[PDB]
Amino acid sequence: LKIAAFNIRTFGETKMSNATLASYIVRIVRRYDIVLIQEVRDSHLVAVGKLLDYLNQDDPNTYHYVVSEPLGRNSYKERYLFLFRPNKVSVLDTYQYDDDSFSREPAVVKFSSHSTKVKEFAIVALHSAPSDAVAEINSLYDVYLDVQQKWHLNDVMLMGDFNADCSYVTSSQWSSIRLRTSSTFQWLIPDSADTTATSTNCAYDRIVVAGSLLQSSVVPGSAAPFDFQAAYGLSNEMALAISDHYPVEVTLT
Amino acid sequence: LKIAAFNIRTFGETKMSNATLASYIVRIVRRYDIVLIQEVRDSHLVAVGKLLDYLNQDDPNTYHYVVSEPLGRNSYKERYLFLFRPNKVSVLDTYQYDDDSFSREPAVVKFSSHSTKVKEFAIVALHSAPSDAVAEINSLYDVYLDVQQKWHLNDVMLMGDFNADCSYVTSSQWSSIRLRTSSTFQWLIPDSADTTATSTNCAYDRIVVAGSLLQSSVVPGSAAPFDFQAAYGLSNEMALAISDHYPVEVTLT
DNA sequence: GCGATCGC
DNA sequence: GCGATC
DNA sequence: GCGATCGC
DNA sequence: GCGATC
Numbered sequence: 049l050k051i052a053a054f055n056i057r058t059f060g061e062t063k064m065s066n067a068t069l070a071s072y073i074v075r076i077v078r079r080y081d082i083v084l085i086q087e088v089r090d091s092h093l094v095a096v097g098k099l100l101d102y103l104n105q106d107d108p109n110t111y112h113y114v115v116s117e118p119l120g121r122n123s124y125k126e127r128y129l130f131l132f133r134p135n136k137v138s139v140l141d142t143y144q145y146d147d148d149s150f151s152r153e154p155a156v157v158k159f160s161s162h163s164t165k166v167k168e169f170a171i172v173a174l175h176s177a178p179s180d181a182v183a184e185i186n187s188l189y190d191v192y193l194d195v196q197q198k199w200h201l202n203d204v205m206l207m208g209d210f211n212a213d214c215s216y217v218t219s220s221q222w223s224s225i226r227l228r229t230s231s232t233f234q235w236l237i238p239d240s241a242d243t244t245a246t247s248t249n250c251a252y253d254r255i256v257v258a259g260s261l262l263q264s265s266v267v268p269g270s271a272a273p274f275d276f277q278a279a280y281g282l283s284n285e286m287a288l289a290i291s292d293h294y295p296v297e298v299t300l301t
Numbered sequence: 302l303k304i305a306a307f308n309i310r311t312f313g314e315t316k317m318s319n320a321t322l323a324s325y326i327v328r329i330v331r332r333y334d335i336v337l338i339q340e341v342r343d344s345h346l347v348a349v350g351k352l353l354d355y356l357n358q359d360d361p362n363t364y365h366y367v368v369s370e371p372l373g374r375n376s377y378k379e380r381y382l383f384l385f386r387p388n389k390v391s392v393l394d395t396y397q398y399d400d401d402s403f404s405r406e407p408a409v410v411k412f413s414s415h416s417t418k419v420k421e422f423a424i425v426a427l428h429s430a431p432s433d434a435v436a437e438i439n440s441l442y443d444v445y446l447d448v449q450q451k452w453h454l455n456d457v458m459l460m461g462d463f464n465a466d467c468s469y470v471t472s473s474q475w476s477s478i479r480l481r482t483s484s485t486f487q488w489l490i491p492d493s494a495d496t497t498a499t500s501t502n503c504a505y506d507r508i509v510v511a512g513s514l515l516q517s518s519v520v521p522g523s524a525a526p527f528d529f530q531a532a533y534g535l536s537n538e539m540a541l542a543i544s545d546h547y548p549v550e551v552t553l554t
Numbered sequence: 555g556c557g558a559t560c561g562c
Numbered sequence: 563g564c565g566a567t568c
Numbered sequence: 569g570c571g572a573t574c575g576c
Numbered sequence: 577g578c579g580a581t582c
């Protein structure tokens with residue numbers, strides 16, 4: 049099973065209405081069984097509708113989805129969108145963590161997976177606020193505890209664009225982040241990875257796993273950023289038109 | 302007499318050490334009798350030394366100067382530098398306004414001018430904080446009153462990079478700015494001027510005059526931004542390497 | 555400092 | 563058009 | 569979100 | 577290397 053987290057810069061009607069752009073997004077999305085799409089700025093779900101239409105052109109149930117409400121303290125809101133192949137996994141339950149620790153309160157989905165060692169697991173999504181990256185990543189530790197009590201599940205994948213490097217999270221701040229220091233979690237995407245399509249070299253996008261079953265289901269060395277620029281022979285300009293971030297992915301067995 | 306205010310993006314040792322860059326700065330500076338240079342990030346005055354050396358290669362007294370101390374609340378400091386031709390004008394007095402209304406407290410120079418209608422006038426320099434543009438421009442009204450009481454002088458020129466347009470000062474904020482609403486002042490650079498070398502079209506840099514004598518000394522239509530890119534046949538890249546702003550200038554008679 | 559979209 | 567973001 | 573220098 | 581800016 050292939051899972052990815054993808055920050056698609058300002059995913060909305062404008063990008064989904066460009067046929068060239070749409071085609072590349074569709075291509076990327078089709079690589080995965082489960083894909084978290086962040087930065088969905090689509091109050092009426094018109095862009096999301098268009099995407100599913102493309103994905104479901106040959107079989108109406110190729111992909112299904114779960115979408116959060118528009119999240120944000122002020123006028124700037126984003127949804128978390130989970131795309132999944134219904135023949136591979138099912139959604140057992142979902143929940144919106146709500147506390148005010150986060151700009152975009154984490155969306156949590158409990159999945160059933162027939163084809164892998166782990167049979168049931170949750171995914172916690174987070175597109176952190178660049179400005180409050182340290183505190184938010186640190187707050188995810190409490191979300192993990194929450195999920196654990198709510199569903200009696202230890203097998204949890206924490207994923208998204210954490211802004212977890214470069215100017216947002218410096219080297220001296222790591223020690224104050226419980227999600228990082230705790231031995232309960234395994235960070236699949238290392239600090240040395242480059243998850244940006246831009247000129248920077250930053251490990252913004254992360255994949256964090258907790259639980260013995262989930263940890264043992266991970267295929268060694270499968271976790272990495274997917275450089276779509278290199279894969280598809282695009283120019284930097286074309287790559288940036290799709291997104292400023294690369295998806296981060298992992299394979300489960 | 303020709304007076305200008307020029308924000309030279311990060312004026313410092315790096316820019317002054319590039320001979321091509323230095324040459325263009327020198328060319329620009331030589332157009333004027335009095336020139337306010339902002340964004341001087343030169344704690345030891347090495348860049349300022351180099352500039353004067355160029356300017357004074359043929360006659361040791363071609364240009365003289367007055368420099369403020371490094372100004373700023375925190376670690377980011379800038380000096381205000383006034384370059385003047387000593388055969389044209391003299392410095393009678395200077396003063397550092399100090400209150401905490403400003404990020405970079407205005408430097409004030411009182412000049413003597415033999416060749417023009419106005420014989421004595423002050424120049425108030427301000428490189429406002431982009432973020433607190435409205436309040437700072439509004440605070441200049443109080444500085445004007447200050448100068449007026451200190452020296453019994455009504456002939457005052459307020460100049461610099463006020464960040465007075467586009468996202469920093471919007472249309473609905475103008476009415477709260479006393480320097481703008483008061484009939485005491487004449488705004489020489491209009492809102493329709495473009496003072497940036499970048500792609501934006503903004504009237505950031507301004508020239509404001511108070512006092513009857515000074516107002517009547519102004520040559521009608523002489524006040525404008527000096528587009529050095531167009532003047533010297535530079536590429537956009539070369540122009541931006543010099544500065545992101547154009548000098549604003551005026552002629553007095 | 556810059557540039558972009560959304561959602562009014 | 564422009565504010566709140568990334 | 570990005571990129572630049574200074575001044576440690 | 578990195579924080580405080582523009």
Ligand SMILES: *[C@@H]1O[C@H](CO)[C@H](O)[C@H](O)[C@H]1NC(C)=O
Nearest residue numbers: 066067068069285286289290
């Ligand atoms: C799609 O976006 C790209 C990359 O930004 C193009 O430049 C193209 O202009 C857009 N769409 C067109 C009209 O088909």
Ligand SMILES: *[C@@H]1O[C@H](CO)[C@H](O)[C@H](O)[C@H]1NC(C)=O
Nearest residue numbers: 319320321322538539542543
């Ligand atoms: C001067 O700066 C320019 C413009 O940015 C050049 O690209 C040039 O590389 C610099 N100086 C050189 C070494 O002489």
